């Protein structure tokens, strides 16, 4: 149910640059992480904290610490690694739980091939990272895995989301929180988001 289209000018601006078909795989990739950072700040605003004491240059000081077991960042392989740099900047001690998956372009169905989750995931907040949310198959498939491993409390970070994807996600896991940099118009006959920003995966890696 909770959806957030971060409207911060810096996010709106940086996303703008990513849309130029002329951009380079290098700059494109970087921008992805910059936006990735901002979405992470916006999405971790509700982390619980706790007073602890340490020794400061002037004697014992009381400080705040995010409490609980380290959060886990879940990148959906290939596409997702492009935003990991920026996410990790805000949360460097996060445990990285990778999930490999790719979309069958004929059936538009997801095809999971690899999974490696941190342990005790039931005690952690999961942060799923992925460039797009087109049909929604990949994010939905990935949330099922996390929930199967026993994870509750999940937040999805996307750069651009298509209304269809959002709708499919809400039907499958209303208990999740969606933070996107933009909600586009919809999908074309091939499952690509429009306006959107092309094949994010290929662009980020420089493949075709």
């Amino acid at each position: 149910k909770k959806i957030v289209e971060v409207k911060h000018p810096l996010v709106k601006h940086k996303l703008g640059l990513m849309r130029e078909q002329d951009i380079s795989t290098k700059r494109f990739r970087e921008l992805a992480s910059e936006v990735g950072s901002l979405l992470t700040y916006e999405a971790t605003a509700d982390l619980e904290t706790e007073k602890v004491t340490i020794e400061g240059w002037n004697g014992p000081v009381e400080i705040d610490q995010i409490k609980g077991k380290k959060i886990t960042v879940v990148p959906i392989l290939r596409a997702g690694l492009g935003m990991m740099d920026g996410v990790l900047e805000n949360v460097p001690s996060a445990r990285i739980s990778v999930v490999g998956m790719y979309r069958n372009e004929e059936t538009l169905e997801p095809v999971p091939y690899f999974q490696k989750l941190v342990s005790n995931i039931d005690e952690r907040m999961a942060l799923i990272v992925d460039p797009m949310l087109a049909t929604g198959g990949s994010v939905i498939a990935t949330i099922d895995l996390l929930k199967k491993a026993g994870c509750s409390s999940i937040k999805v970070l996307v750069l651009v989301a298509a209304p269809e994807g959002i709708a499919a996600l809400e039907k499958a896991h209303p208990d999740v929180e969606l933070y996107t940099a933009s909600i586009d118009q919809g999908l074309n006959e091939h499952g690509y988001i429009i306006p959107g920003l092309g094949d994010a995966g290929d662009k980020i890696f420089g493949t075709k």
Copy 2:
């Protein structure tokens, strides 16, 4: 009159880590930027925008662009440089105006020694970045320089602030906006913020 103490959980957490005695020049310097990045996001939430039509991956597309002349980051020399990496990760195109001055460890006042501002400051927003606001003599001294050079919209990003300094900054330039990561108890005999975080300048650079 505008004073924002960013109480986001990642700021309190990274800030707490900076308080440790133990902390090395390397990690202290990173945390200075991390927190500095986050402080910018808050400080730059008001940026104005404009619509534009560029060539997208799938034809014409209207995007957002931050309007007007690039902003300028004004680091107060030495300590200030410690927070630039993070500030420029948000506004990489910003113009850097260095202003160097040190505090008279005796009289507790600012001693200017160098300044090189961008041109056309009239039409530019300025972000003064300095680690600590103790007496406020430094920030206030540099605001004076910028206002003399024609700048009208100024924002100050700080890690820790003493009420004494916030009180001084306010009665000197109330038309300024203060963004701090924490407001501390006050100054001690020799003018240092308590708890505060030591010689921010010395710790960033590793000098004695």
Copy 3:
């Protein structure tokens, strides 16, 4: 045939930092990339160049450009990604051909579960990057994959290496270059490199 063990003091130092059991994932991950950069510099020392004239700050000027199609970096999935940051800082436009295979002490002849190479792989140099070269199994397997695709210029970048692996690799693909930061004593009963540095994959990602 061609084996290089970089003995630059900075490499030895950073690698030495990577051996403290107490180290953290964040720090270990960064260092894996710093060494990764230095290793990349040592392997691209023989890249071909070509003159080109452009518009310099003051009139035309002849410069040197790295001739040929862009090189492709090939990180072996999971661990390999931890050294990606460092490698890309040196070759920011390199195409990223990822290869993923599951490897255990039981996977004597690893098979990819996923892979996505760049096109015209036969007209490029390929830099395979993987933290540990224990039995050689994983790396020699991805060289077969690359050679079949048509690639005929391959360099391998590794953090630590066991004589076992180095020997196997040499027996399997002598026409390849091996750059390593350290050649350790050998392997133990369970397949780990000794001294080595433990399960590089798990430390880098923070899993188990």
Copy 4:
């Protein structure tokens, strides 16, 4: 007397990109550090090591680490800061001793204005970093500074250097090592390196 023009194809390639007139401050500032890192690698290849035994992941391990007092990096204020990022990446533990002095553009001679060096400078290796060595006035002037403070082993890292500056430096201090990415043709009427790369200070900071 010892001069070293790094001829690495990656150093020539990154320097070439810097030659473009249309380049951006962000990109330009970024290449400065990239080349600066490589220069550091080249200049620190002769540092001494000392073995030490620490607790490894699987028990005792003998490691190598750099010997002696931590080195100090001396960026000549303003321009020099543009390369700091890269340098520090190879020696984060370094003590940053800054020195400010702008060149009198009528008398082409340095004008000192700030300095803050680390203690025991006479027991450390100095590392002076400044973008361009035109006439050699600034580097010679700051080496005077360091020698006066008792420093006796200095290395100068620069991106481009004019034969004039190299000659002046040698006459003045032949016991120093000079590392550069390019020895240009000479100085034009107004004392600017040719081809060179414009006014580094301005391009790096985005001023005028």
